Design a binder for this molecule. Structure first.
Ligand SMILES: OC[C@H]1O[C@@H](O[C@H]2[C@H](O)[C@@H](O)[C@H](O)O[C@@H]2CO)[C@H](O)[C@@H](O)[C@@H]1O
Ligand SMILES: *[C@@H]1O[C@H](CO)[C@@H](O)[C@H](O)[C@H]1NC(C)=O
Length: 431
């Protein structure tokens, strides 16, 4: 896609801190950028849309390469159109704004490069307020193995780059992405909703889901893929789980793992109020060249340090971190296949972390599964009593997008105090 000039692109500031054991924390003047899927796409010579609603203009966009040459991404009114605002250290993402639903932004080092995070033997910390984020919604903070320039160097057809939020990929190999590899994804375009559709290609890469949550339930989940970096897929390579990527991941949700009173309204981690979330990525030898061996989670609320809940499921060791062993045991007890290990488990996840990943923040509803996999019983054809089926207390009729968009459109999530660096250095303790 080309870079449009009808609307200036001014990225909101979102400061983060980089931390070391000896030096403490130092601020970075990072920014955020709206993902390309949400932007206005129009002819490079004017104001005519290349895409409107859920369909492309066949005149401007007869094939992918022609479309990418004729069509430009333009600047965005972050607050006005998309309900995205920043204080400079806290990002608020609103659910419905006019006819817009949800958003996704990326953390930027400067105006043309995403911030590349290398988190092996490191930790990531942030604060979250989910008081106004109910059943059926997801406020997510995650890492994807995207290129720092949004694909510009690899794909001549992409002249927009990270400045316009290009180059998404994730472990679900999504085919709903409009531009992939510098070409419009217009082949066999099929409508899937009022403003969405899918094309013949998907875009896949490894993903680390640090936080997917609402005030009823939370999960953190590595998704390794057999490839390295963003890759366009077609046909069976895009199929979920059986293709290049593990779409299911190895998840840790405290309610699913048998502690129904750990996290939620008025619980140990009280989701009615703000709290801090720490995630540490440990290697077998405590160096940044080692193999990823455990992912640990700590919470802090009202100054109390809260260790992660322990698994309480028959056949699963009572542990509170993600390791390859836990993943194998959980996949058995719950009756799911271990696609995670097939793609290479934590070691393959670590190689992606090592190579650097991009941070995404987003608010969304789920057309396919109604977020029931996060906060309800899932899958809907399994006994609500079997281990691994119940993931929260929300009703099985909740999360219908048409419903939540009418019922709770002013829902929002606030992410703040983003910090990363040496293990044990983004937070402290005392007696
Ligand atoms: O696609 C919805 C959701 O799936 C999540 O995986 C589920 C999987 O679908 C289900 O078969 C299994 O029982 O549980 C896992 C974990 O919830 C996946 O982790 C999500 O990213 C995805 O959005
Ligand atoms: C790595 O650090 C952990 C602290 O989490 C410690 O238990 C362990 O002994 C260290 N291992 C090595 C090889 O130093």
């Amino acid at each position: 896609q080309q870079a449009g000039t009808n609307t200036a692109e001014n990225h909101p500031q979102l400061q983060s801190q980089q931390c070391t054991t000896s030096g403490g924390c130092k601020p970075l003047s990072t920014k955020v950028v709206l993902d390309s899927n949400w932007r206005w796409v129009h002819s490079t010579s004017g104001y005519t849309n290349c895409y409107t609603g859920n369909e492309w203009d066949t005149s401007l966009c007869p094939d992918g390469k022609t479309c990418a040459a004729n069509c430009a991404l333009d600047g965005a009114d972050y607050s006005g159109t998309y309900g995205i605002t920043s204080t400079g250290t806290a990002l608020t993402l609103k659910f419905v704004t006019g006819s817009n639903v949800g958003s996704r932004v990326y953390l930027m080092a400067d105006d043309t490069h995403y911030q590349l995070l290398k988190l092996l033997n490191q930790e990531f910390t942030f604060d979250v307020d989910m008081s106004n984020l109910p059943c059926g919604l997801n406020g997510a903070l995650y890492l994807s193995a995207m290129d720092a320039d949004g694909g510009m160097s690899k794909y001549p057809g992409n002249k927009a780059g990270a400045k316009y939020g290009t180059g998404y990929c994730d472990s679900q190999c999504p085919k709903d992405i409009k531009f992939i590899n510098g070409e419009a994804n217009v082949g066999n375009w099929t409508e899937t909703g009022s403003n969405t559709g899918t094309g013949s290609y998907g875009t896949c890469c490894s993903e680390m889901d640090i936080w997917e949550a609402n005030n009823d339930a939370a999960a953190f989940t590595p998704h390794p893929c057999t490839t390295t970096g963003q890759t366009r897929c077609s046909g069976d390579d895009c199929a979920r789980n059986t293709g290049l990527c593990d779409g299911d991941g190895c998840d840790f949700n405290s309610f699913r793992m048998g502690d129904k009173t750990f996290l939620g309204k008025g619980m140990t981690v009280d989701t009615s109020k703000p709290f801090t979330v720490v995630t540490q990525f440990l290697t077998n030898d405590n160096t940044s060249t080692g193999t990823l061996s455990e992912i640990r989670r700590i919470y802090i609320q009202n100054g109390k340090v809260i260790q992660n809940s322990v698994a309480n499921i028959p056949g699963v060791d009572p542990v509170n971190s993600i390791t390859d062993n836990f993943c194998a045991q959980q996949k058995t007890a719950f009756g799911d296949t271990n696609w995670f290990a097939q793609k290479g488990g934590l070691k393959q996840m670590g190689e992606a972390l090592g190579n650097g990943m991009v941070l995404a923040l987003s608010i969304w509803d789920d057309h396919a599964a109604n977020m029931l996999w996060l906060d309800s019983d899932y899958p809907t054809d399994k006994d609500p009593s079997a281990p691994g089926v119940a993931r929260g207390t929300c009703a099985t009729t909740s999360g219908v997008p048409s419903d939540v968009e009418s019922q709770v459109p002013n829902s929002q999530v606030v992410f703040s105090n983003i910090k990363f660096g040496d293990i044990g250095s983004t937070f402290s303790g005392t007696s």
